[PDB]
Amino acid sequence: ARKFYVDQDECIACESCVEIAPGAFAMDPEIEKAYVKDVEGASQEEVEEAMDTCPVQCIHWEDE
Ligand code: SF4
Question: Has UniProt tagged this entry with the keyword Iron?
């Protein structure tokens, strides 16, 4: 159906998204950045709001 995720590649180090989704997004030591590991940790309204909170928006939904 509809998916999504991020590329901690363009993630500076702010928890802006992590807050709008302290369950799906969360920076790590391997990616020393926030990564959408748990898509269920953030609802579309939450995961989304957090995505709009990012400065560069290093996140992208995955349809396929
Ligand atoms: S909102 Fe954007 S810059 Fe801040 S941790 Fe999440 S991915 Fe990183």
Answer: yes
